[PDB]
Amino acid sequence: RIRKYLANYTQDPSTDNFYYWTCVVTVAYIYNLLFVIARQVFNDLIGPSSQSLCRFYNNSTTQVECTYNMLTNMKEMPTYSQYPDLGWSKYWHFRMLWVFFDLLMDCVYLIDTFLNYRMGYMDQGLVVREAEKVTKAYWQSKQYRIDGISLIPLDYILGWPIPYINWRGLPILRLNRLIRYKRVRNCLERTETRSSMPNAFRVVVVVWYIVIIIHWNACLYFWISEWIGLGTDAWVYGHLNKQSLPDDITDTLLRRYVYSFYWSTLILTTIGEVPSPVRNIEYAFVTLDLMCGVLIFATIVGNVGSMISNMSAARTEFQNKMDGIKQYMELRKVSKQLEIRVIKWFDYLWTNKQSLSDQQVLKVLPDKLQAEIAMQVHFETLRKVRIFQDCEAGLLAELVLKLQLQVFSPGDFICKKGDIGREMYIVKRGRLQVVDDDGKKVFVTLQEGSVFGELSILNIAGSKNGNRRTANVRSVGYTDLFVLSKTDLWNALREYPDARKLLLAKGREILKK
Amino acid sequence: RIRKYLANYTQDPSTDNFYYWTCVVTVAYIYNLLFVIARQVFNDLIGPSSQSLCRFYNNSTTQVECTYNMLTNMKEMPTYSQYPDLGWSKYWHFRMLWVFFDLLMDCVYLIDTFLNYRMGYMDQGLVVREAEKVTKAYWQSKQYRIDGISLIPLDYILGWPIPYINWRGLPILRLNRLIRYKRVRNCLERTETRSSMPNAFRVVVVVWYIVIIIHWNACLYFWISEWIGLGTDAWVYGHLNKQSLPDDITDTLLRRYVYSFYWSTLILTTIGEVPSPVRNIEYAFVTLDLMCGVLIFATIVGNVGSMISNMSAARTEFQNKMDGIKQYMELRKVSKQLEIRVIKWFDYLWTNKQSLSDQQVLKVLPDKLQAEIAMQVHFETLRKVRIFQDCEAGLLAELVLKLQLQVFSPGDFICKKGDIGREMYIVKRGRLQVVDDDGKKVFVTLQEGSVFGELSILNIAGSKNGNRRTANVRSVGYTDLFVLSKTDLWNALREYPDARKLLLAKGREILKK
Ligand code: NA
C-alpha cells in the first residue's frame, strides 16, 4: 500500500530517475528566477491593477482610458487610477494561471524536500537505505533549515493584490525559493558528465547564465526607470527617450520588456549604443553596469577561448612532436626518402586515432580495471598459441599484462634471416607474409591472431638453429603486432614452476616433431 | 616602562599583527592615492577658494554670486573671484578635517618607518632580534632614503591656501607619499596567499587597479578640460558639451567628478560613447588614451581568461584521460558491460576527489613532512597487525613509507582461492567479506582497520599451504585498501635483523597455533 510504501521509502541519489528529478527541480528553479523578478518589476503579467488614463482632445480635453492610438506618439505618459478590486474581476483567469503554476512548482519543492528527508547517504562505500539512519542524518545535518526557508508560503498571503486592505502585492517575497541552487548545480554537473560535448555544454550553460543576467538587468533598468519616473528624461523608458518610443510605436507591456532587454543586452555586452544618462543617479547606475558588462564580456571571451584551446590541444601537441622530428631530421641530414616515410606514417596514425601507447589505461586506471581490460583483449588470443594450451590461467593473466604494441608500415621487415630472436609476435590489425630472401611469398601470409616466434622465445638447447630468426617476415600493409619479450615470459614462468615444466616439454616436443 | 620597551623593541615580519599593520599601511596608501590627486584637480574638496560669479538678468544684467538656478541651463560658464582669505573663514572645518586625516596617515607612515628601523631580518634561518644588528642592517641598507623621501612634510607648508602670500596651495606635493608601494605589494601578496579564493582575489585586485586608473584618468580629463578652458568646445566639460550639462542639470562638484568618471570609464574600456575631440591637443589626448584603454581592456580580458582557464584545468585533464580511455576501449573492441563499469568508477572517483595517487605528497613535500604525514596516517594502524606488535618503530616507519593504495568497486574480488599471494591488505574506507566460492558470506566481514594476508607475506616453510591465497575476498562497496608488498617488507627487514627474528618467530607461532 502507499502507506507502507511512503513509510519505508528511501532514496538512492545515483539512479537515473533521480537525475530526471533533479532536472524537474531545475525547471522549477528557472521558473522561479525568471518569473518572480518579472512579476515584481512589470506586474502587468498578472493583469493591470490600475487603469491607464490619457488626456484626450475629442470638443475639449478630458481624461479617459487610454486606447492604443492614445499610447502612440504620446506627448506625456499616462496616469494610473487603481480599480476598486485590484483588477481581480477582469484578470482572475490570468492570476489563477499564475497561482496554479506557483502551486505546481511548490509541489515540486515539497516532493524534493521529502526526497531530501528520506535521502540515502554513502557510508563505507555503500548507500545507506535504512530509513531511521537517513532521517537521523538529515536531522543531524542542517538541511532542514534550507528546505524550510525555501518554502515559506509568505508569497501566498502578501504576494497578491488584496483589495480589502488596499495591498497591491509584493511578488518579490518568492525569492526565498531561489535558495535551492544546490540541486540545480548538481543537475548541471551531472548533465556535463553525461554530455557527449562537455566543452560546448559548458559554454552553453554560461550563455544561459548570461541571458538570465540580461533578464535581471532588464528588470533592474525598468525598475530604476519607473522609480525615477517614466518619460521624465531621455534615458528612462518613456516618450522623451525616442529610442524607447519612436514615431508609430505603441507603449505596451511587450514594448517595455523588449526595449529593456535590448538596453540591457547593449550595456552588458559593452556595445553601449543606448541613450546617455542624464542625472547623477543614472550616471552611477550606468557606470557600474558598464563595469559589470566589461566583466561579463571578459567572462564570455574567456570561456569561449578556453573551449577553443581545449578542443585543439591534441592537434597542437601532435604538431609540436612532428615539428621536433622535422627539426631533428634536418639537423642530422636525413635522406629525403626516409623523411617522407616518417611523415607518411605520422599522418597515417594521426588519421586513425592510435596514440601509439597503452599508457592511458596504464596510468589512469586501477590495476583491477587494467587487468580486466587486458584480459578481455588478449586472453582468448593467448590461449591459442600452442605452447599456452594447458598452462595455468594466472600465468596467462601475467602475460597479457606484459604485451607491448609494435606498429609497422607497408613493406617493412619485422625480421630477417640471421637476426637475433628474443621475441614473439601476435598479429592484430594487419597481414604479414614470409618471403624467400626478398623474393616471392614462400608459404603463408599471417592473418590476424596468428603468432610467429613462439619457439625462439624458449631457451632450448641446440634446437635446430641458434637464437637466430631463420625466416624473413615483412608486413603487407600497416600491421599492429603485439610483442611478448623473452624476459617477461621467463619472469612469469619463474613465478610458475609447473607451467615452466609444461612449456619446456611442449616446446621440445614441437621442435622434435 | 615604555622607555625601555621602545628602546629594546624589534619587529618580526612574520607575525599576524604585522600583517594587520601592513593592511593599515595599505589603507593609508590608498587614501594618499585617491585624495591627493582628487584634491589637486578638483580642489573644491577643501572648500572653494573663489566665488563663482554669474551674469544675471534681474532690471538689468549684473554679475552676482551664482545660485543653483544660475548654474542650470547656462549660456556661459561662471567666472571666479578669489576671497581675501582663500575661503578659510567659511571652510576651515573642511580643511581641518582634511588636515586631521593627513596627519593620521602621516602618523601611520611614521610608525611604519619606526618598525622598519627596528626590523628583524632573517639570517641563517632564524629572525634576528637584536636591536643593534637590525638597526645596523637598516643603516647599511638604503631603506632610510625611501622612508625619508616619502615623508617630507612639504605639503604642510605649500599644500594649502595661504592668503597672506596669495598662494593657493599645491596639493600635488603629497605625491611623495606614494613611494611606499613595497609594503602595499606585500600586503596584497600576503593576502593572496591567505585567501581561500586566490584566482578571484587576483581578478579583484586587478579591477581595483582598473578603478584607480579610471579615477586618475577622470582627474586627468578634468584637468585638461580646465586647462583648455571649460565650456570652450563640445569636448571639454562645460555648457557646450551637452552630455556634461544637459537641460535641467546643475553644474556642481559632484557633477564634475561624476561626468569625468563616466567619460574615463567609457574611454578606458574602449566603448567610446563620448563626444568627439575638437582640437588637435584633444585629439592627441584621446588617441593616446584610447590606446591605453585598448591595453587595459586586453589586461582585464587576459586576467579573467587566465582565471577561467586555471579553475577548469582539473576537469579538463580528467576529461582528456576519460576520452583516452574511451578511445582505447573502442579501438580494442571492449565489451560494453566493462565500459559502463569503467565509466561508473571514473565518475565515482571524480565525484569524491581521490586523484588515485599519493604523488602530491611524494613529489612536492620534503622527506621530513612526507614521513611525518605517513606516520600520522598509518602508524597506529600498522601497530595492530599482530606481527608488528613488538618490533622496532623504525621498521614501522620504513613500512608506513611504502604503503601503496589500491581501490576497488562493488562486488570486485580482491583475491580468489588458488591465487599467488604476495601481499598484505589494510582496509580503509570500505568493507570486504570472505565468501565460500561465490556463495554466502562465510565467517566475517572486514571492517576498516582490519588486515588480510599478513601471513602470506612471510617466507615460512611448508606453512600449511603454498603461497596460494586460500580464501575468497570481495568488496561489498567501494573499498580503499592499502597494500604492503612482500619485497618492501623484506627490504625493511633486511635492514633489521632482530626485527626479522621476531617477525618470523611470531609468524611461525601464529601458524602453529
Ligand atoms: Na556609437
Contacts of B324 in chain A (CB under 8 A): 355, 360, 364
Taking the centre of ligand 1 as the mean of its atom positions, its distance from the CA of residue B218, in whole angstroms, is 21
Q: Does residue A21 contact residue A112 with C-beta atoms inside 8 Å?
A: yes
Tell me the three cell numbers of residue A65.
482610458
Between CA A463 and CA A457 the distance in angstroms is: 12
Between CA A450 and CA A445 the distance in angstroms is: 9
> Which residue type occupies B266?
L
| CA distance to B4, B10, B115, B117, B122, per residue, from B127 (Å) | 21, 10, 15, 15, 4
- The CA-based angle B85-B86-B90, given to 5 degrees, is 80
Smallest CA–CA distance, residue B484 to chain A, in Å, is 15
Tell me the three cell numbers of residue B486.
612482500
A11: DSSP letter = B
Between CA B17 and CA A509 the distance in angstroms is: 85
Q: Does residue A292 contact residue A199 with C-beta atoms inside 8 Å?
A: no
How big, in percent rounded to 5, are the helix, strand and coil portions of chain A?
55, 15, 35
Residue B3 sits at φ, ψ, to 5 deg, of: -60, -60
Between CA B510 and CA B478 the distance in angstroms is: 31
Q: What's the start-to-end Cα distance of chain B, in Å?
A: 75
- As separate numbers, helices (DSSP H) first and strands (DSSP E) second, chain B gives 16, 15
Q: Which is it for strands B404-408 and B441-446: parallel, antiparallel or unpaired?
A: unpaired
- As separate numbers, helices (DSSP H) first and strands (DSSP E) second, chain A gives 16, 15
Query: Which has the closest alpha carbon to B500: B353, B387, B421?
Result: B387
Between CA B309 and CA A310 the distance in angstroms is: 10
Residues whose CB falls within 8 Å of the CB of residue A331, separated by 6 or more in sequence, listed in order: none
Binding-site sequence positions of A for 3',5'-cyclic AMP: 454, 469
Between CA B324 and CA B343 the distance in angstroms is: 12
Query: Which has the closest alpha carbon to A374: A395, A405, A397, A407?
Result: A397
Helical (H) or strand (E) element with A20 = helix A16-41
Contacts of A302 in chain B (CB under 8 A): 301, 304-309
Tell me the three cell numbers of residue B130.
637584536
Tell me the three cell numbers of residue B73.
541651463
Question: Could you give the 3-state DSSP secondary structure of residue A58?
Answer: coil
Q: Does residue A353 contact residue B331 with C-beta atoms inside 8 Å?
A: yes
Contacts of A124 in chain B (CB under 8 A): 429-431, 447-448, 477
Residue B418, judged by CB atoms within 10 A of its CB (0-12, 13-18, 19+), counts as: middle
Q: Does residue A415 contact residue A472 with C-beta atoms inside 8 Å?
A: yes
Between CA B56 and CA B75 the distance in angstroms is: 11
Tell me the three cell numbers of residue B471.
580464501
Tell me the three cell numbers of residue B174.
603629497
Q: Does residue B179 contact residue B28 with C-beta atoms inside 8 Å?
A: no
For residues A29-60, one letter each, b for 16 or more C-beta atoms within 10 angstroms of the residue's C-beta and e for the rest, the string is bebbbebbbbbbbbbbbbbbbbebbbeeeeee
For residues B94-118, one letter each, b for 16 or more C-beta atoms within 10 angstroms of the residue's C-beta and e for the rest, the string is ebeebeeebeebbebbeebbebbbb
Q: Which is it for strands B122-123 and B126-127: parallel, antiparallel or unpaired?
A: antiparallel
| CA distance to A217, A260, A282, B297, B464, per residue, from A289 (Å) | 9, 14, 10, 16, 80
Tell me the three cell numbers of residue B209.
587597479
Task: Considering only CA atoms, give the Rg of chain A.
Answer: 38
Q: Does residue A404 contact residue A479 with C-beta atoms inside 8 Å?
A: no
Diameter over CA atoms, chain B: 129
Q: Does residue A185 contact residue A179 with C-beta atoms inside 8 Å?
A: no
Query: Which has the closest alpha carbon to B23: B186, B179, B143, B176?
Result: B186
Residue A284, judged by CB atoms within 10 A of its CB (0-12, 13-18, 19+), counts as: middle
Tell me the three cell numbers of residue A168.
497591491
Kindly determine whether residue B308 and residue A303, on different chains, have CB atoms separated by under 8 Å: yes
Tell me the three cell numbers of residue B473.
575476498
Query: Which has the closest alpha carbon to A275: A247, A241, A250, A248?
Result: A241
| CA distance to A411, B234, B265, per residue, from B221 (Å) | 76, 14, 11
Residue B68, judged by CB atoms within 10 A of its CB (0-12, 13-18, 19+), counts as: exposed
Between CA B381 and CA B369 the distance in angstroms is: 19
Task: Find which of B263, B268, B273, B479 to mutate to test the A interface (most A CBs within 10 Å of its CB).
Answer: B273
Taking the centre of ligand 1 as the mean of its atom positions, its distance from the CA of residue A259, in whole angstroms, is 18
The full DSSP string for B282-344 is HHHHHHHHHHHHHHHHHHHHHHHHHHHHHHTHHHHHHHHHHHHHHHHHHHTT--HHHHHHHHH
Task: Give the 3-state DSSP-derived string for A333-379, with helices as H, strands as E and coil as C.
Answer: CCCHHHHHHHHHHHHHHHCCCCCCCCHHHHHHCCHHHHHHHHHHHHH
The region that residue A333 occupies, defined by phi over 0 for left and psi between -120 and 50 for alpha, beta otherwise, is left
Q: Does residue B218 contact residue B263 with C-beta atoms inside 8 Å?
A: yes
Q: How many CB atoms lie within 10 A of CB A144?
A: 13
Helical (H) or strand (E) element with A162 = strand A161-162
Between CA A264 and CA A267 the distance in angstroms is: 5
Between CA A489 and CA A395 the distance in angstroms is: 9
Strand partners, B11: B119
Helical (H) or strand (E) element with B261 = helix B253-268
Between CA B131 and CA B138 the distance in angstroms is: 10
- Cell numbers 588458488 correspond to what residue? B418
> Which residue type occupies A242?
K
Q: Does residue B453 contact residue B442 with C-beta atoms inside 8 Å?
A: no
Residue B35, judged by CB atoms within 10 A of its CB (0-12, 13-18, 19+), counts as: middle
Which residue from B305, B332, B407 is facing A377, i.e. has the nearest CB? Answer: B332
Q: Kindly compute the dihedral angle of the four CA atoms of residues A270, A271, A273, A274, in this order, to the nearest 10 degrees.
A: -30
| CA distance to A286, A298, A481, B22, B267, per residue, from B297 (Å) | 18, 9, 55, 30, 10
Residue B12 sits at φ, ψ, to 5 deg, of: -105, 120
Between CA A162 and CA B503 the distance in angstroms is: 85
Report resolution in angstroms.
2.6
For residues A90-101, one letter each, b for 16 or more C-beta atoms within 10 angstroms of the residue's C-beta and e for the rest, the string is ebeeebeebeee
Smallest CA–CA distance, residue A361 to chain B, in Å, is 6
- Cell numbers 635492514 correspond to what residue? B495
Helical (H) or strand (E) element with A64 = strand A61-65
Contacts of B356 in chain A (CB under 8 A): 364, 366
Task: Find which of A16, A124, A269 to mutate to test the B interface (most B CBs within 10 Å of its CB).
Answer: A124
Compute the residue count for chain B: 513
Tell me the three cell numbers of residue B325.
580511455
Residue B378, judged by CB atoms within 10 A of its CB (0-12, 13-18, 19+), counts as: buried
Reading across the β-sheet that carries B50-57, which strands appear in turn?
A: B61-65, B50-57, B79-82
Between CA B70 and CA B80 the distance in angstroms is: 14
Q: Does residue B345 contact residue A379 with C-beta atoms inside 8 Å?
A: no
Query: Which has the closest alpha carbon to A291: B304, B157, B330?
Result: B304
Spell out where B312-439 has E strands.
404-408, 413-415, 423-428, 432-435
Q: Does residue A468 contact residue A462 with C-beta atoms inside 8 Å?
A: no
Query: Which has the closest alpha carbon to A490: A452, A458, A445?
Result: A458
Question: Could you give the 3-state DSSP secondary structure of residue A434?
Answer: strand
| CA distance to A98, B423, B461, B467, B510, per residue, from B505 (Å) | 81, 19, 12, 18, 9
Residues whose CB falls within 8 Å of the CB of residue A41, separated by 6 or more in sequence, listed in order: A219, A220, A222, A223, A226
After which residue numbers is chain B interrupted with C–N beyond 2.5 angstroms? Answer: 58
Strand partners, B472: B435
Contacts of B273 in chain A (CB under 8 A): 272-273, 276
Task: Considering only CA atoms, give the Rg of chain B.
Answer: 38
Q: Kindly compute the dihedral angle of the four CA atoms of residues A209, A212, A214, A219, in this order, to the nearest 10 degrees.
A: -150
Between CA A236 and CA A286 the distance in angstroms is: 12
After which residue numbers is chain A interrupted with C–N beyond 2.5 angstroms? Answer: 58
Taking the centre of ligand 1 as the mean of its atom positions, its distance from the CA of residue A273, in whole angstroms, is 6
Q: What's the start-to-end Cα distance of chain A, in Å?
A: 75
Tell me the three cell numbers of residue B205.
585586485
Residue B357, judged by CB atoms within 10 A of its CB (0-12, 13-18, 19+), counts as: exposed
Compute the residue count for chain A: 513
- Cell numbers 542639470 correspond to what residue? B249
Residue B82, judged by CB atoms within 10 A of its CB (0-12, 13-18, 19+), counts as: middle
